[PDB]
């Protein structure tokens, strides 16, 4: 085991004011800040600020030598780009999310050049829930899709263990699955007044599970494959759909869950529960809401397995009619 | 705010990676706290101080940027304490695996919470060679997560204490896997799995910001025993894990009574302790039966922490439990 986790995690109103404090604790003196256009107001303690596009337009090294860490502030592009650059410079990364739409906040995954790959987990995570609470509702709702997908990811991971002898950690699996279960239970039973707070905790916890298992397995399975497949097709058919990753994964979760349910009667009804919790926080549950033609969903399901060399309930592949059947049995079309 | 380790290593040869890790953390001048037996592993230029020099008696330490604790539990705990005092990071390098102080943010009475070690470097080649007794006693520290978790739930339910189901389950599952391993294998990898378990259990504490997932009524029972050793001036050399394992057998029984769902649990725990040659009875432990009984009776008062013991155990109830469970 060689495991990298965060050193400091903060999740509270006002958190953004503690960046200084944390840098001091970590004995970090000169951070490079990676951020975006409309987050410059949260950056007013620092001096070296770079926008993520500068980096993304040339992903290649000896002009950053003076910096001892990187601080990513803002949305997902900001955090992912900052994480990437820290990895490249071999220095620690500090995650300061202003949104909470996915688990890149705390995870050691970089999703700049899909496929994703594994780097070090951020050394600190500073999640100001006063700021995150005011992020676009749509991004918060999409966070739900990212969390519920731990369920199918864990089911796929067990399946891969059983059927293919893949490395599996029961205690990471259960942690990741339970994080999502608690979040689902909260959205189904509360007034949702603390959702943002609990979403962030879930996203973060889910990040830790990944670090702890040294794999994205506890957080990503066939539902994510389905999502990547959708993305390919948006590009390949030049669609203009503004669809978010977590929205897509949530819907992938509904469906993949149903495939598991067929094989494992003990899980029957799980997909309806996931469906419910997504509805309850305003997250899409069908292609129409998501914005797609039915044929794209079907095609995406049929080509999900090929996306990555990762065993899942999809197995050797779905047929176009198994696909349709699933999508319609499932309410997605 | 949650403080966890940054780097955790569990492998054969791990001790050789101390420099590699210090460099990754940009630390340059560690003070090493250790014991006489463990100098053999202190193959480096760093200043070395023995834990008793500290325990018998601030500005001699200003030039150090971290503390590295190498050895047994006194070493790790004394090193953790001093790091906290100097406001510098602590690196845990255990040579034995008798308890979860290896990776926890706990200093130990009453124990208190500091930062979790910034790194944990557990060399399983070294740990494999530790005295059998100490490894067996690790089992007692792990199985006690089961009752700790049960007490936590209970306190949540009955007293609306702050509870994290995902932390609870993580801790409980760690112990379940370790129990399952010792009941079903040849134990050839026990030391390896015990260490992973002790470390995981440490992370659970850091993550919940509480010892709850790792420590409950069974630890109360242990602390009570300890008080009585001191208070009666007994010369018993009984280890913390050994005491907690026995506490776990008994406390699990209390939970079983109330929850038929848990039927058989205490015998499972007893079995797993037997399987690694850990004590399950007072006589193996070293004690008179009255000490056990008195310790049960006064366990709840030890700290303000609701458990299955609730308001307290009566002397008859205590005896009855201790004998129903084979401990006396
Ligand atoms: Mg996920
Ligand atoms: Mg324990
Ligand atoms: Zn995702
Ligand atoms: Zn303990």
What is d(CA A244, CA A209) in angstroms, rounded to the nearest whole number?
23
Same domain, A88 and A229: no
Contact criterion met (CB below 8 Å) for B127 and B14: no
Q: Based on the fold, state whether residues A182 and A322 are members of the same structural domain.
A: yes
Residues B117 and B150 placed together within one structural domain of the fold: no
State whether B165 and A175 contact (CB < 8 Å).
no
Total number of domains in chain A: 2
Q: What tokens appear for B260 in the block? A: 């038929």
For residues A128 and A139, membership in a common domain is answered with no
Of A289, A204, A281, A283, the C-alpha closest to A246 is A283
Structural contact between residues B73 and B28, judged by C-beta atoms closer than 8 angstroms: no
DSSP A67-132: -SEEEEEESHHHHHHHHHHHHHHT--EEEEES--SSGGGT-SEE-SSSSPEE-PPPSEEEEEHHHH
Q: A208 and A316: one domain?
A: yes
Tell whether omega for the bond before A315 is within 30 degrees of 0, i.e. cis.
no
Strands B119-123 and B90-94: parallel
Q: Are B117 and B91 in contact (CB under 8 A)?
A: yes
- Whether residues B124 and B22 share a domain: the answer is yes
The answer to whether residues B125 and B144 belong to one domain is: no
Burial of A85 (0-12, 13-18, 19+ CB in 10 A): buried
A182 in B contact zone (CB under 8 Å): yes
A126, A238 in Cβ contact below 8 A? no
CA atoms within 13 A on the CB side of B131: 9
Residue ending a domain, among A92, A116, A134, is: A134
Q: Please report, for residues A102, B6, B89, B155, B303, the alpha-carbon distance to residue B112 in angstroms, rounded to integers and kept in the order given.
A: 35, 21, 17, 20, 12
Residue A141 and residue A25 in one domain: no
- The SS3 call for residue B106 is strand
Q: For residues B238 and B224, is the Cβ–Cβ distance under 8 A?
A: no
Max intra-chain CA distance, chain A? 59
> Which residue on chain A is closest to B192 by alpha carbon?
A1
- Phi, psi at A94, each rounded to 5°: -120, 120
CA distance B178 to B162: 27
Query: Which residue's entry shows tokens 């776990």?
Result: B248
Sign of CA dihedral A279, A251, A96, B113: positive
A178 chain-B contacts, CB cut-off 8 A: 165-166, 169-170
CATH code of B116's domain: 3.40.50.1970
Locate A80 and state its tokens.
């992912």
Cα-Cα-Cα-Cα dihedral of A294, A298, A303, A307, to 10°?
Answer: 50
From A1, A171, A182, residue closest to B173, measured CB to CB: A171
Assess whether A16 and A127 both reside in one domain.
Answer: yes
List the single residue in B with minimal CA-CA distance to A28.
B26
Where are the extended beta strands (E) located within A112-241?
Answer: 117-118, 124-128
- Which of A100, A134, A168 delimits the end of a domain? A134
Cα–Cα distance between B225 and B218 in angstroms, integer?
Answer: 11
Which residues, in sequence order, are bridge partners of residue B123?
B11
Integer angstrom CA distances of residue B305 from A319, B165, B299, B300:
57, 18, 10, 8
C-alpha to C-alpha distance for B263 and B243, rounded to whole angstroms: 23
Shortest Cα–Cα distance, B168 to chain A (Å):
9
Give how far the C-alpha of residue B288 lies from the chain's centroid of Cα atoms, to the nearest Å: 24
User: What is the A135 CA–ligand 3 centroid distance (Å)?
Assistant: 19
Specify whether B58 is located in the same domain as B122. yes
On whether both A182 and A114 belong to a single domain, the answer is: no
**DSSP letter, residue B298:** T
Residue A129 contacts residue A16 (beta carbons within 8 Å): no
Q: What is the resolution of this structure in A?
A: 2.5
* Chain A: residue whose CA lies nearest to B196: A1
Q: Tokens for B182? A: 């010792």
How far does Cα A238 stand from its chain's mean position?
A: 24
Distance, in Å, from the CA atom of A275 to the CA atom of A253, rounded to the nearest integer, reads 9
CATH number at residue A231: 1.20.1090.10
Burial track B68-85 (b if 16+ CB lie within 10 A, e otherwise) = bbbbbbbbbbbbbbbbbe
Helix then strand then coil, % of chain B, to nearest 5: 55, 10, 35
| Residue A18 DSSP label | G
Sign of the Cα torsion A111, A116, A122, A125 reads positive
**Structural domain for A123, as ranges:** 1-134
Q: A134, A159, A175 — which closes off a domain? A: A134
- A294 and A161, same structural domain? yes
Residues 6+ apart with CB under 8 A from B126: B15, B41, B95
């Amino acid at each position: 085991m060689i495991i990298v986790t965060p050193r400091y995690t903060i999740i509270e109103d006002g958190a953004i004011n503690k960046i200084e404090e944390i840098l001091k604790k970590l004995n970090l003196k000169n951070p490079l800040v990676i951020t975006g256009k409309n987050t410059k107001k949260y950056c007013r303690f620092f001096y070296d600020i770079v926008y993520y596009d500068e980096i993304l337009n040339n992903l290649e090294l000896k002009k950053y030598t003076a910096y001892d860490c990187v601080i990513g502030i803002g949305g997902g592009r900001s955090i992912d780009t900052g994480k990437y650059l820290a990895y490249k410079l071999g220095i620690p990364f500090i995650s300061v999310p202003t949104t909470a739409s996915n688990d890149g906040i705390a995870s050691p995954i970089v999703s700049i050049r899909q496929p994703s790959f594994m780097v070090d987990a951020p050394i600190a995570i500073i999640a100001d829930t006063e700021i995150i609470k005011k992020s676009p509702r749509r991004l918060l709702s999409a966070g739900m899709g990212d969390i519920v997908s731990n369920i199918t990811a864990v089911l796929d991971w067990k399946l891969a263990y059983k059927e293919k002898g893949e490395k599996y950690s029961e205690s990471s699996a259960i942690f990741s699955k339970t994080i999502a279960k608690e979040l689902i239970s909260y959205v189904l039973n509360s007034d949702l007044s603390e959702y943002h707070n609990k979403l962030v905790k879930a996203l973060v916890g889910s990040g830790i599970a990944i670090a702890i298992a040294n794999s994205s397995r506890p957080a990503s399975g066939s539902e994510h494959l389905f999502s990547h497949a959708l993305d390919k097709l948006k590009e390949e058919y030049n669609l203009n759909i503004n669809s978010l990753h977590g929205e897509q994964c949530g819907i992938g979760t509904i469906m993949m869950s149903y495939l598991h349910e067929k094989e494992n009667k003990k899980l029957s009804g799980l997909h309806e529960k996931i469906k419910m919790s997504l509805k309850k926080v305003d997250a899409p549950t069908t292609a129409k809401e998501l914005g797609f033609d039915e044929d794209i969903i079907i095609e995406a399901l049929t080509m999900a397995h090929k996306i990555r060399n990762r065993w899942t309930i999809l197995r050797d592949g779905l047929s176009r009619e198994e696909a349709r059947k699933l999508a319609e049995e499932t309410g997605v079309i």
